[PDB]
Amino acid sequence: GHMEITTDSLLALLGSEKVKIIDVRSADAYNGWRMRGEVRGGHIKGAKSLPAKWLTDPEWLNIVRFKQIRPEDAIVLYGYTPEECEQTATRFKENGYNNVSVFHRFHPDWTGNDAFPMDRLEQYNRLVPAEWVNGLISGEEIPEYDNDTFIVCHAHYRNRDAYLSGHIPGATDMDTLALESPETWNRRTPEELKKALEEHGITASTTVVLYGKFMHPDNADEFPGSAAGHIGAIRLAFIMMYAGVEDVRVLNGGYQSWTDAGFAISKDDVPKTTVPEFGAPIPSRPEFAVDIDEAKEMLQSEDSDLVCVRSYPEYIGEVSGYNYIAAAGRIPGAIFAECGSDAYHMENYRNHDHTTREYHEIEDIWAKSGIIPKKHLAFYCGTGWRGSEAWFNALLMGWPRVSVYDGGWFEWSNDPENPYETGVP
Template sequence: MSNKSMFTEISTDELVALLSSPKAKFIDIRPVDAYNGWPLQNEPRGGHIKGAKTLPAKWGNYIDWIEIVRSKGILPEHEIVLYGYSKDKMEEIATRFQKSGYNQIKIYNHFQDEWSPNTELPMDFLPRFENLVPASFVNKIISGERPLEYEGKKVVIVHAHYRNRDAYLSGHIPGAIDMDTLALEATETWNRRSPEELEQALLKHGITSDTLVISYGKFMFPDNDDEFPGSAAGDIGAIRNAFIMMYAGVKDVRVLNGGFQSWEDAAYEIATDDVPKTPVENFGVNIPVKSELAVDTPEAKEMLASSTADLVCVRSWPEYIGEVSGYNYIEKKGRIPGAIFGNCGSDAYHMENYRHVDHTTREFHEVAKIWEQVGITPDKHLAFYCGTGWRGSEAWFNAWLMGWPRVSVFDGGWFEWSNDPENPYETGIPENSNAEIYS
């Protein structure tokens, strides 16, 4: 491609002048991990230009690319400014915009050499981005190219699944061991197991409080809801496991952003061997270390009565209004009175409102904006719940990554709440004459 761009290139000063324009949309086409804060090309400051949207170049290959663009509020009347690592990629995406009816397109080619080094220019990042890792981070760990802070540190890579070792044996990250989510949660309640059981499970998998754990899963779609307790995705099981390990006291737990799909997209080596677990004898601390991360029913009731706390229902609309229970092993339909609707997506097996199309965690600004519109704000103590804990754990992880100070999972969720005939519940649309309250 010629060095001369077919699109207008703007300077740093021109971009600064556009920051205050309501018509300007700044689009970061780098990988979403770079947007979150990972300096993937050794840029001086990790993160993104403040106010920018993430639209990775690899999404340009998706058939529904333009729907993704529009869902982010990027419209033809806007003045589009693209930036990234590669000028060729910027021009490629600019051409896609042009073919889709966008005519005001500019390219900014100085993010790495001018914007990132200049601390006076505004940038933003996901506060706890280091706990949501790119595939390249995991690859460096297993290849021995560890940053100095990880030298000598024991690392356990965990492939999470729910009663499906075939998902692991059919392809996993080299060196990863498998962990059934049932090791950490009980089928009777779907809640986290007792401290004694958690300790034994973690020791069996070679995990102590000082172990660096990288948790990931593989996206799976169930044939029926008997097979999965809370989601169709193994990657959400990875977040569920991560939550329980953090509750127990594992100090450094990371989640692979996008799960196994991200590993495959990066074209890294895939293994099929059955990696043996190496048990250890001493966890190092008394479990649980972070009990505040989990809320049980008595505290959930206190939170409902408090003006400084909220329960957030991370279920689908049909579940929330009581049209369906979500799973065939949950009899009652409805919601906890007073819970805020946190909308997981289309049904009990999807979290599309918290995910990008490639299964990576959704742009955190978008999640925060959606939550703010329904009154979910960081100034309160928030406890996220769903049917049995998986979706609630993923929503909790979003808030925790954003650095929100008091966020928990109401572990019992609708399953535990609805099984107690003494607990009230309601159906119908809230604040509507059709809503019915049962007690």
């Protein structure tokens, strides 16, 4: 019943402003993961991501409208299989979208023929799906993995209960306080990171798969970070990558993506299998970390900028954003990139299933504010968690000079002589 567009008609529609090509597959296949063993992973050039699993969520229509997909547009759906687009095509028709067509020949006609344009996340192999993690712990052959030593880490902030309430089988928990000091809220000393990483069984040659569990943080609680598990996992990914771990993966979406895939969980308290040595100088990637002295230089140079990954009430100085940060204000000269509702949510960088937002939508918003890969960018926030997530998103894009200003507003405001702004800009 649904209309069909031929491959030649779709090739002619490429570049039109009225046409919207929508990838129905998962975000990981959209990012570049070859989920069905295709010769070439990714999406049709110019396509948007709207996974079919979002149909069971009542915000589907709001997600579509938020992506500015209007009924005036010619909708072209595709996936690994045209029958996988039948449910989405019907839902579009039931909501006032009359021009809905299904592209039947994406796999293997578009994937196998390199003459057809395809785009992908340049560093997608660091944003692993749940199926990849399951194959890793099962000893099965998986793509984008050529190592022999791995470890799955469940990140949390003074909350082992986040690990004991349910985790990936065989995984071990790492409190974020093991890699960052509560005094400076920055990354720890190399000697401290060396001891901490070794005691958790992590070497530089180890493939560390990091993930966290979202447990709905509340700003009024004592330690809301204990529920922002996935932000801490990306925060720990930044520190480990800065330390010298070469193969660091992050589970796209966190713990929920594991359970949403139908994989069982474990509640065991897995003991740590320590390693005698880390095996590399810490830090082996010093470029990833930027401190306050270098941050002030980047504010003065047109070659560099700092990206304020904070919430709007924090940016205008209405609130500090934390129950342990006294001063309220913003660093002058930094480019504002709103993170989300408060300091413990990343709505502007995530989907409703906590997977990373469509990376094309992120770089377009960043481009409108001057945040471009041409510059050396040091993302920051209150202490570094939200800045690390935005930094990881840019690193997945392949940006050559992205860093994290570790000190953030906390270190900046701890000095009374540092300038600061307030109110609406």
